[PDB]
Write a protein that binds this ligand. Structure first.
Ligand SMILES: [K+]
Ligand SMILES: [K+]
Ligand SMILES: [Zn+2]
Length: 357
């Protein structure tokens, strides 16, 4: 079994010209790549080339209006770039941003193609800018185009329209964009674990609560696991996987798993406030590898402590390469509100998934 890896230093060119210390840094991807070199993981992977996504591929999930506006930013002067960025919720834009977003998406398409053709068993995509907050018609939360959503549709386009794709989103923030893109769809199961705080945590919407289960034929196919009032870590995430993620995933029987792999729930993150360890992320990855005959693509989303994300994503790659899971620290009893969250999701999803009964 071969593991794929995609990384292209051109994705570093997207930058914040007014605030060069903004946490969505160019060096997020070079640091993760460097740590893979350090641990001698890079030579163990098959290197998959990056490419630009096409406008036609972007149209799988995004409106032409949205594509056109972001495309136009490539030739704007700094004042217009500042003005445009400020129209969105939490976005900065440079002349290279559009191209970088295209590269992120096209990198993941090549990776999914490699997985689905059998060239690799699984893969990791060290990409930026991130995707999961991007909506059909707007940019949001450092995201321009919804890389993971686009990848699911790209995968369906080269196999069959009803290919069952599981998206597990373990970034500490709710993937608002991914939820909305697939909300009426039963071919793409969306499972998000996120810090919620009764709607007080970015992106600040009650769309992230456990009662949002999908619409129309997508009823039951949107699973939100919202955390409230607690510094959640390995015990809570392992419990969520045991009680919710894995039973639902096995019943869905995905043919491809995409991980919206933010590392901002990691111990040390400046924004997330959580304490998931690298060993934690390794165990989550290892569990997901039991699905879809091991066809797993890990896509970088958020995560802002450069040391933490580097160690955490490298450990995921180590798992995809078939290395033995590292030992977790003794798992303490769950924070009381985490039990409450898990039970709430169980109640909301019991009608749709017989494995939860
Ligand atoms: K999430
Ligand atoms: K869905
Ligand atoms: Zn995030």
């Amino acid at each position: 079994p071969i593991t794929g890896l995609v990384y292209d230093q051109r994705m570093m060119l997207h930058h914040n010209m007014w605030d060069s210390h903004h946490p969505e840094l160019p060096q997020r991807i070079s640091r993760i790549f460097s740590r893979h070199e350090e641990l001698r993981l890079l030579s163990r992977c098959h290197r998959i080339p990056a490419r630009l996504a096409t406008e036609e591929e972007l149209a799988l999930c995004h409106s032409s209006k949205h594509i056109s506006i972001i495309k136009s930013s490539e030739h704007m002067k700094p004042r217009d770039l500042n003005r445009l960025g400020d129209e969105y919720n939490s976005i900065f834009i440079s002349n290279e941003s559009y191209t970088c977003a295209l590269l992120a998406a096209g990198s993941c398409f090549n990776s999914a193609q490699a997985i689905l053709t059998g060239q690799v068993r699984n893969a990791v995509a060290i990409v930026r800018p991130p995707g999961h907050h991007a909506e059909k018609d707007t940019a949001c939360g450092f995201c321009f185009f919804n890389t993971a959503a686009l990848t699911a549709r790209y995968a369906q386009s080269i196999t069959r329209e009803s290919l069952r794709v599981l998206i597990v989103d373990w970034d500490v923030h709710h993937g608002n964009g991914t939820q909305h893109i697939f909300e009426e769809d039963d071919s793409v199961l969306y499972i998000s674990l996120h810090r919620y705080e009764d709607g007080a945590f970015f992106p600040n919407s009650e769309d992230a609560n456990y009662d949002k289960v999908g619409l129309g034929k997508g009823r039951g196919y949107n699973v939100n696991i919202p955390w409230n009032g607690g510094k959640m870590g390995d015990p809570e995430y392992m419990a969520a996987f045991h009680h919710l993620v894995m039973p639902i995933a096995r019943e869905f029987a995905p043919e491809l798993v995409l991980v919206s792999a933010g590392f901002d729930a990691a111990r040390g993150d400046p924004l997330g406030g959580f304490q998931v360890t690298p060993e934690g992320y390794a165990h989550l990855t290892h569990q997901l590898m039991s699905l879809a005959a091991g066809r797993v693509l890990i896509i970088l989303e958020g995560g802002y402590n450069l040391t933490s994300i580097s160690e955490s994503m490298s450990m995921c790659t180590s798992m995809l390469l078939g290395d033995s899971p590292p030992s977790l620290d003794h798992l303490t009893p769950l924070k009381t509100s985490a039990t409450v969250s898990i039970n709430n999701v169980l109640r909301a999803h019991a009608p749709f998934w017989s494995s939860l009964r």
